[PDB]
Write a protein that binds this ligand. Structure first.
Ligand SMILES: *[C@@H]1O[C@H](CO)[C@@H](O[C@@H]2O[C@H](CO)[C@@H](O)[C@H](O)[C@H]2NC(C)=O)[C@H](O)[C@H]1NC(C)=O
Ligand SMILES: *[C@@H]1O[C@H](CO)[C@@H](O[C@@H]2O[C@H](CO)[C@@H](O)[C@H](O)[C@H]2NC(C)=O)[C@H](O)[C@H]1NC(C)=O
Ligand SMILES: *[C@@H]1O[C@H](CO)[C@@H](O)[C@H](O)[C@H]1NC(C)=O
Lengths: 109, 94, 10
């Protein structure tokens, strides 16, 4: 509606018998192919990302937003659980690093 | 009659885009939507597995991501049945 | 947190 791409701003400009818009859009570029997965089973329970997507640098698995590639370690704050991991088609296995468990273990143990 | 459209100085100009290239445009748009979701409409087309794109669109209407995945077969059957019924809907009512 | 934390610690 306002320029091709993801719209950000629009500065109007007056013209004789009309108006001229400057649609400032956001156009993604430099895309990179990545192996995805609908969910990540860790302990028999599927984990779906709260935001963004699960992506794999070929070997490791990460979670990042869709429109930009910022790989982040899959923690239990980036993902929400829903049921067991036997009904989601295409589920992969990995280890959702919980931030609390190693923190408390290092604190106590 | 439409067979002889010349009549008396009554020219019927042909459309610049014939049905074949219009259908090619529609097919390209279909392929873009299927294999790239909304990404191709706002820049380069980024491939995204269909079920995952469907989950993304589910996220846009309120239902969480896992609603589709746990119901993927049901939703696929519903979609295929509806798209089957639309043809008979068009045929039955002229 | 509290139930799991107490279960681990106690
Ligand atoms: C994906 O795979 C490689 C190899 O597993 C990953 O390498 C590790 O991750 C860190 C952080 O990115 C790298 O700097 C190290 O080389 C590896 N060390 C660890 C912590 O295992 C890497 O994340 C990705 N790189 C590639 C090859 O795409
Ligand atoms: C994810 O890990 C689980 C558990 O490690 C795997 O479940 C095993 O699947 C094999 C099938 O080859 C069964 O014989 C085992 O009994 C299962 N173990 C248990 C206790 O669940 C599962 O296959 C893994 N999934 C993937 C895609 O790697
Ligand atoms: C990713 O890999 C596929 C298949 O190997 C290739 O067709 C595609 O162009 C690649 N995409 C990018 C942007 O690297």
């Amino acid at each position: 509606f306002c320029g091709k791409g993801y719209h950000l701003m629009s500065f109007p400009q007056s013209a004789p018998h009309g108006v001229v818009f400057l649609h400032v859009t956001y156009v993604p570029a430099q895309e990179k192919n990545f192996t995805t997965a609908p969910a990540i089973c860790h302990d028999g329970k599927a984990h779906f990302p709260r935001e963004g997507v699960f992506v794999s640098n070929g070997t490791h698995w990460f979670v990042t937003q869709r429109n930009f590639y910022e790989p982040q370690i899959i923690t239990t704050d980036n993902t929400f659980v829903s049921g067991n991991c036997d009904v989601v088609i295409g589920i992969v296995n990995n280890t959702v690093y919980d931030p609390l468990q190693p923190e408390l273990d290092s604190f106590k143990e | 009659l439409i067979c002889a459209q010349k009549f008396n100085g009554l020219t019927v100009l042909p459309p610049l885009l014939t049905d074949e290239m219009i259908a090619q445009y529609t097919s390209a748009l279909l392929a873009g939507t299927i294999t790239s979701g909304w990404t191709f409409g706002a820049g380069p087309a980024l491939q995204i597995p269909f079920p995952m794109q469907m989950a993304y669109r589910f996220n846009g209407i309120g239902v969480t991501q896992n609603v589709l995945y746990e119901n993927q077969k049901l939703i696929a059957n519903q979609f295929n049945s509806a798209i089957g019924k639309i043809q008979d809907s068009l045929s039955s009512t002229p």
